[PDB]
Amino acid sequence: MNKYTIAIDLGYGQIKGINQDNKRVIFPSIISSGKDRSLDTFFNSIDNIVDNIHVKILDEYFNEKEYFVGELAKRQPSNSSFINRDNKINSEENKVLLATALGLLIPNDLPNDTKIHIVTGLPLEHFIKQKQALNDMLKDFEHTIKFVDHNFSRNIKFEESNITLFPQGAGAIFSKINNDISSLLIKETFIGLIDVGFKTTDIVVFRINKDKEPVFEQEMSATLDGLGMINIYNTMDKAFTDNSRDGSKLNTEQLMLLCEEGKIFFKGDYIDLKKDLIKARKTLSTNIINKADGLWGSRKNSFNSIMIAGGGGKVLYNHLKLIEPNMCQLIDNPEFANAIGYLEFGKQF
Amino acid sequence: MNKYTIAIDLGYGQIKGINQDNKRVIFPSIISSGKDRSLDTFFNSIDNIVDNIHVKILDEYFNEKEYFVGELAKRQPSNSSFINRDNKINSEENKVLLATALGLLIPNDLPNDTKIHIVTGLPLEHFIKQKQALNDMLKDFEHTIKFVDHNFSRNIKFEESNITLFPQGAGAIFSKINNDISSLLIKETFIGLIDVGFKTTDIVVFRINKDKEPVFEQEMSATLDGLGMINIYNTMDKAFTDNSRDGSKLNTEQLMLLCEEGKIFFKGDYIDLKKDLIKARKTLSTNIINKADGLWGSRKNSFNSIMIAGGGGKVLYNHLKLIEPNMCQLIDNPEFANAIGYLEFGKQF
Amino acid sequence: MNKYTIAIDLGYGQIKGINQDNKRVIFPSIISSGKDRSLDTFFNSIDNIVDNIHVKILDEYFNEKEYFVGELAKRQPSNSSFINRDNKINSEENKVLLATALGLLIPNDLPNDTKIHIVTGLPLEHFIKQKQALNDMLKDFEHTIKFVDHNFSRNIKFEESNITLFPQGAGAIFSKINNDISSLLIKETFIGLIDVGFKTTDIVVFRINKDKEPVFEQEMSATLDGLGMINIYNTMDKAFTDNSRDGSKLNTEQLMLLCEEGKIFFKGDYIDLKKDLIKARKTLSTNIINKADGLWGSRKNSFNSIMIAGGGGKVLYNHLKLIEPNMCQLIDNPEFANAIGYLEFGKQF
Amino acid sequence: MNKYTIAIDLGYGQIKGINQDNKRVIFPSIISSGKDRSLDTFFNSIDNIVDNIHVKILDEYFNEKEYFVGELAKRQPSNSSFINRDNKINSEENKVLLATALGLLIPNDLPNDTKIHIVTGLPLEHFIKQKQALNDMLKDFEHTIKFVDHNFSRNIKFEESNITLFPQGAGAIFSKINNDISSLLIKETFIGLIDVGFKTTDIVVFRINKDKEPVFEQEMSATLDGLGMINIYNTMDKAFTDNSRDGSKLNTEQLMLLCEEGKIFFKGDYIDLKKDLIKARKTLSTNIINKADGLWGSRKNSFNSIMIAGGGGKVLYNHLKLIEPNMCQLIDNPEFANAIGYLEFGKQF
Ligand SMILES: Nc1ncnc2c1ncn2[C@@H]1O[C@H](COP(=O)(O)OP(=O)(O)O)[C@@H](O)[C@H]1O
Ligand SMILES: Nc1ncnc2c1ncn2[C@@H]1O[C@H](COP(=O)(O)OP(=O)(O)O)[C@@H](O)[C@H]1O
Ligand SMILES: Nc1ncnc2c1ncn2[C@@H]1O[C@H](COP(=O)(O)OP(=O)(O)O)[C@@H](O)[C@H]1O
Ligand SMILES: Nc1ncnc2c1ncn2[C@@H]1O[C@H](COP(=O)(O)OP(=O)(O)O)[C@@H](O)[C@H]1O
Ligand SMILES: [Mg+2]
Ligand SMILES: [Mg+2]
Ligand SMILES: [Mg+2]
Ligand SMILES: [Mg+2]
């Protein structure tokens, strides 16, 4: 047979991905130490493997460690703090999250003719800026996974001509909608793509030519580092200490429980910040419009399609609608548009 | 040895050039600053070198200033003005346009005893006026051009008796038709050449003598200063602001996009002004018919053929037909009539 | 700084060189003084500059010394001795011969700051011994060349980061077959490269690993000093005194003229030594294979392709076929095998 | 809008083409340089445009060359020598011939929003192997044609989903008889189709199923590369030189004239080679039957219809009948068997 293909996302909110065979996984970017589980196995059945990933990671050097990752690390109070996780792409913590989705997307008993073409990504301004460290790490990568409670290993090792990078959401509109939007693109019109993530937020536009082929705008597209969904979590934390006034702080779970709900269950009571929830949501999306028109002068008048994506874009649709109503819309998977955009435009390989 | 020859046109609509190979280049007269390009190479194509002219310029102090020019400069929001770009031929803006067309037309590794001829143009009412300023500038020219992201370079330095100054429209019908009009001309008549330039329209006529040689008449031929395609850009500019009723000013790109077609795209929908485009073209056509008859009394009634040139000569031909029907016609290259007219008449030396 | 590239050789029989632009020269390594060529100038057209290298050479103390070098010096009776030539890489001979092919391959129209990466060579066994002396010499190099009878000159000076030092036969099969022998190299084999030069004979092998990467074996690879084409010229010279039966002896030009053909025209008639030319070339070919197997035991069975290099192997290929038939083969440019190998593997910088 | 349909063929013998309107053209696959035809215009009236295709074809950079092509090229002594047409599918020989019939088969003044489906083919073994080689060449096809002496231009540029790819001889029976031979096809037999091409004769078989539908066999069907009418031109070329006994060689035009007649005229005489023409036609027909039954065991008895095609099939039908009498019939248009088969099966899209 031929060599296999995997597209995953290294997004700091939740690690996303979808393979060649349209199996997809998603889990928050939280890791923890792993400890052996037989007791809770007896009480509650682990029905979703992704729900309860306890994982061991092998190496030739014999430096294996058990890890709780994702949802199983989210229940941990001893997990990663996640509000200040470092953006070192070559870090050992990023090795845990990346090696997690590998065996999840590799089906059981693939032959040796199959070799995994990984397709991952960088931020837009960090694409050229942070290319070589991840190029070094994926060249460096040589491990073997071990699933606790499911008991099947995957030797994971990558040569060159098996790795592929693209910028964040590059093929999300260069592919995956580009056959669909051929009805809408006509002549010299900018289509708009916005990806609202946790740490960072990217807005990317493609100029089409007279020949109806898209071309990239590096001066009409940039990376909004420091503007993202993490600012809502940083605001709603400070609003909770404004609402509790004890000095008490939510943990890593209750903070991430808040900005989906707005009504935290604290001291047996619903400490409410519903007004401060919506105000922080109109805070962030308005701060995007200034950064949108910071790259968009009179050229906003030539737009024909505004698309938004990202998990933040799911919960800021009407908040970010005021860029251009009756034109802005929502992509089918706001979160998975990076990975499928890495998939379909990765199907050049 | 002999010296290689490149003919270029410094017309303000678009810069047009050709060398001894008959290799021809053409690009608009729009410049912008040079910005680093590594990201856009990963997205789209570079192979259209005319489309992507990022270019280093070494100066007499040999200090780099990068520039965008033409189509790459046209997509910039901070490009040159181009609607009131300076008419000074000694401008550093013109230093960008002059060296750029040379770099695409100097072949790789010419012989060392071969040097460079250049044949340029001046406006017909400005050739006596603006002769020695460009004669100073062409002799002062010592620069080194470096194509960014195509990566080949030329050190270009001229001396005296290498440059050649003719008026604009001098050799377009002196040469370039002399081998073809010999079956056309009869005796003691005039031929018609009207070069519809962008800012100024050039009108030139030749008397043929008894020996069937073109002799020039400066009293029946002059420059239409201020009359040209730049009036159509000014006319349809008001036509879009009056149709939008918003103060909606087009940029440099949309304005050239408008008067090419008349169907501008504006905020999700088209603003169609195809009707007023005919009215602006009938205006400029009438602006040439009446100014022709000032130079042409009943001496017009002794013509054999009328050719028209310029890029604006291409778009007017149906409404500029009514100067003289069944005698007016179009030259074979309305854009390249100047530079090829500079070329063969530059081969007199 | 788009720095230029020129790859040269220091071959005793002749100098082989090529630039970045794949312009290549070849000329014998024979020097003489320079004398005023104006008399022959009116007689015969001095057209081939490579045939007619009368060259003016300055130094740091501006001491101009004209030299006949190459083909014209070979025509001179008072030439370089060249069959007992000193092997000092820092010789004035090598100062001229290295500076010879520089200006013959330094192109026209170079930028002001742009330097040239020079790639050179050493004998393989002496690459440890003589690394300092050429690095002493290339750092020393500060001169100015000038070309008599072709009316152009070049500046010539280099520093470090422009120098590049790979041995003879190193990059010839490392690169230049790199993506072509990759389909031939499979697992745990050796590839054979033998340079049959004039004075020296090189043997170099490369173990390819499991990972399809060549690795070097210094103990299956050696420089056979004292074996080469210089034996055949010295053998047939005494044979010329034999078959002439008079004690008469050739000159240095007839020395290289003989064993290219074997039928020297002497005293109004040919002198036939064609039998001994077949004898000596088979005799040297016997001495190559035996000393090849001096480094090659049963590891000759671990070969998959043998290539030969140098000017001698081109005319020895029928008699050098006996190493391993249909596994041994001839490289396409037997002279320029080191040169292009110096080129692309010298293009790492 | 609605898109037109033109079916062409890239046959090395002669180009065969038809449109949606059944207006069909045929001309030999020979090109030559073009020269100014006005002297012959006055003597003989140019009526047949296909006889007299002098043509000039622009690129997208205003480079174009004069070309005689076809019968007009067969009158030229320095034309495409027709034994050495370029086997690269992206050759300029292919480029001019492809645009030739497309200039001839697009009627005048079609709407610009109405495109044209082009339907092509490849030899059967070379179809999938060279599919993307043609697929990029069809997308690269961007030209503008100009006919000398008839003076009507066509703009010619098509992308993907404007093209159509089915092999040589595939749709010849998969359409145009597949909905007509249903009285003859019953169950589990094989229909026979042999396209006798110039270079390559194709053998293709369709099995019919239980459900009275054709299914393809690839082990009973093959391309005979090097078997075709090109053997006869090569054979009789020796036969003329063996009968002349002088070394007098026929030209390209006398070659094709020979193996249509067998009686060339030569220096006041007919050099009779009719017997050698009998020798070639029985030999080639025997060679086709042998390679047919190489692919065919006792499944030759499982036949019900044997059709043949090609221009060679037009001139070998008696000798090629001897596979099976009363079953070896001839198709309607032996040249245009691919053409209408490309047309009607191209009407599926
Ligand atoms: N149902 C939801 N309710 C509230 N917030 C959500 C929801 N789904 C996703 N999010 C937010 O979106 C973020 C996920 O963004 P994502 O598309 O993964 O971007 P990145 O690639 O930067 O991780 C999460 O941090 C979360 O706060
Ligand atoms: N296809 C076209 N459609 C509309 N306008 C055109 C077209 N081609 C050229 N032009 C017009 O012609 C002008 C080019 O004139 P040109 O011959 O370059 O004269 P100049 O020497 O004054 O620059 C442009 O400014 C443009 O408006
Ligand atoms: N056509 C030829 N006929 C005979 N000998 C040749 C021919 N071409 C090259 N040679 C021999 O090859 C030698 C050139 O070897 P070369 O590859 O330059 O090695 P080196 O690097 O040691 O100089 C010359 O001395 C010459 O004797
Ligand atoms: N009337 C004819 N007489 C002799 N040969 C012919 C005649 N018509 C066609 N042919 C032969 O048939 C060939 C044409 O084959 P064709 O069907 O075009 O196949 P291809 O697709 O390979 O070009 C010509 O080369 C020619 O030799
Ligand atoms: Mg993201
Ligand atoms: Mg002009
Ligand atoms: Mg050597
Ligand atoms: Mg055919």
Side-chain angles (χ1 to χ4, degrees), chain D residues 166-185:
Chain D
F166 295 110
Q168 179 180 358
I173 56 175
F174 191 73
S175 64
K176 187 182 181 291
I177 204 61
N178 198 5
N179 301 116
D180 293 330
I181 205 188
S182 66
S183 66
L184 190 144
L185 65 89

Side-chain angles (χ1 to χ4, degrees), chain A residues 124 127-128 165-167 170 186 188-189 207 210 214-219 299 301-304 327, chain B residues 35-40 42-44 74-77 249 251 253-254 257 260 265-268 270:
Chain A
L124 180 63
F127 181 72
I128 306 295
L165 295 175
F166 297 114
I186 303 298
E188 292 292 328
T189 62
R207 185 193 296 274
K210 300 291 179 67
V215 71
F216 179 69
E217 294 289 327
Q218 68 181 359
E219 296 293 326
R299 294 181 186 270
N301 294 318
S302 296
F303 290 170
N304 59 355
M327 186 185 292
Chain B
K35 294 178 289 295
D36 292 331
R37 294 178 65 196
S38 64
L39 184 62
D40 50 353
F42 186 76
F43 286 98
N44 300 111
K74 187 175 74 175
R75 293 176 179 174
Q76 298 297 319
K249 180 176 70 66
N251 56 7
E253 181 178 0
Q254 287 168 350
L257 181 60
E260 183 173 0
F265 179 74
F266 182 74
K267 292 175 72 175
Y270 291 96

Side-chain angles (χ1 to χ4, degrees), chain B residues 58 62 106 109-113 116 144 146-147 151-156, chain C residues 1-2 4 19 21 107-114 150-154:
Chain B
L58 289 174
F62 296 94
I106 294 177
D109 289 331
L110 294 176
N112 208 167
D113 199 76
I116 303 170
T144 302
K146 294 185 178 181
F147 288 99
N151 294 318
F152 66 99
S153 301
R154 299 293 186 272
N155 193 2
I156 304 169
Chain C
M1 293 175 70
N2 292 321
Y4 194 76
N19 58 0
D21 294 333
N108 295 322
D109 292 330
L110 296 177
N112 196 2
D113 293 331
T114 295
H150 292 86
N151 292 320
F152 67 103
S153 66
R154 297 292 184 269

Side-chain angles (χ1 to χ4, degrees), chain C residues 15-48:
Chain C
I15 297 302
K16 304 174 291 296
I18 192 171
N19 58 0
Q20 183 177 0
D21 294 333
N22 298 115
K23 182 177 174 67
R24 63 184 183 178
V25 296
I26 182 181
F27 59 95
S29 301
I30 300 174
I31 65 169
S32 176
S33 178
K35 289 180 282 189
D36 291 331
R37 294 184 67 194
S38 66
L39 183 62
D40 53 353
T41 304
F42 184 74
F43 283 158
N44 299 114
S45 297
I46 301 176
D47 186 74
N48 190 0

Side-chain angles (χ1 to χ4, degrees), chain C residues 44 179 265 293 318:
Chain C
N44 299 114
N179 299 116
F265 183 77
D293 293 331
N318 290 319

